[PDB]
Amino acid sequence: TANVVVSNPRPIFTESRSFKAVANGKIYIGQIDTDPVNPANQIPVYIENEDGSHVQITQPLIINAAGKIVYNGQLVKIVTVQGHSMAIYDANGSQVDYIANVLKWDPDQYSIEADKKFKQIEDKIEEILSKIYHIENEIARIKKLIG
Amino acid sequence: TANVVVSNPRPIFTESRSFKAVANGKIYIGQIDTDPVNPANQIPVYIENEDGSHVQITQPLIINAAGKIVYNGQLVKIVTVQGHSMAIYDANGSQVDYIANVLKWDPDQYSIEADKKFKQIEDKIEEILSKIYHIENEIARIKKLIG
Amino acid sequence: TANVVVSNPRPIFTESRSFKAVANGKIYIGQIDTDPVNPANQIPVYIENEDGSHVQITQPLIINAAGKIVYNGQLVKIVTVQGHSMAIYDANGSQVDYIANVLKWDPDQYSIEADKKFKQIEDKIEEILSKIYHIENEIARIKKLIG
């Protein structure tokens, strides 16, 4: 069937040397392959509201005691451009993680499978166009004979 | 290469105000943008067995001390329709989370890239069809001349 | 917009009977639907370096006190073929999990949507080819009349 796994989409952020939340930690979000702590490298981040509206907020993003992103005391869904770097720091200012391009961590790879398939159809379209131009040329020849 | 990240696909469910599992918590699964606690809004959920078979089970789903979904004392893979709402409650009956449409939390976005590409091929197909109809009309004209 | 959720891509590995990291645990990676503890079933695993280079390493993969994969004392990104089995064991040698095919746990399903769309374009291409062959046959007939 088309059935798919039940999952838990809201991310949690945990430390790298012990099993603990990054409580009162900070997340920076930047251009791919840059240092997002530098404001010059930061990109727009937005709360995506329940109704679908978007509100831009400042960086860093704040991680609560549960390891979840919060704004004004509430859980929030933060969105940005698929391709971005991310740096995570704990309340001590120690770096927990750095990801140069979050898009390069996809375990699901149905993008590239599709790109092959698109390239294949384009090849059939080229051959079809070649047949058409040949037919056009046959017609031109006929017209000349009879005219 | 086509190599992709090693990941941990089985979800865990943790609390929202402290870093703890939702031990003996409950998960409800419903139509997109509805309250899944209401039985009228619930949709079928299934254990997907090791052999690929599916067994429908009742709601709520049960979360163990580890924060993993269990049935009859064993870890299970639960499946449902990609588009669904989810509500998670702790053993105290407090709401941990509500997700209106789990599909809208995809960080991987290779669906929409493909939809542009499909629309583009369809455009080439339209132009090809226009050439063909023009050729048909030229042939009709020739037939009339010679007939 | 094309905006997508901020997430936490680096996996963490936690126990199945209590809420704890699989500290000093082991991960085996194998062919789909096999027992990856058996070396005969294991497949190549690689560190994907910051610069994009790949270095093959031995199995098992090692899980640190934080539940993250490490090599030579540092966090690492491990890659392999999308389709693989995975088995996870704790420091006691107890099995934490077994996943027959990690690819079958995708909650995002934009592969199969695309495969329908590809099949549909291929159908238009068949009909287009039929029109073309019919036109070719009309031209052959004309040539015979006039020749």
Curated annotation (Swiss-Prot), chains A, B, C:
Taxonomic superkingdom: Viruses
Subcellular location: Virion
Function: Structural component of the short non-contractile tail. The tail comprises six spikes that mediate primary attachment to the host cell lipopolysaccharides (LPS) and display endorhamnosidase enzymatic activity, hydrolyzing the alpha-1,3-O-glycosidic linkage between rhamnose and galactose of the O-antigen polysaccharide. Digestion of the LPS brings the capsid near the cell outer membrane.
UniProt comment concerning the protein's domains: The interdigitation of the polypeptide chains at the C-termini is important to protrimer formation in the folding pathway and to thermostability of the mature protein.
Oligomeric and partner information: Homotrimer. Interacts with the host O-antigen lipopolysaccharides; this interaction induces cleavage of host O-antigen. Interacts with tail hub protein gp10; this interaction anchors 6 fibers onto the tail hub hexamer.
Sequence similarity: Belongs to the P22likevirus tail fiber protein family.
Designated name of the protein: Tail spike protein
Organism of provenance: Salmonella phage P22
Gene for this chain: 9
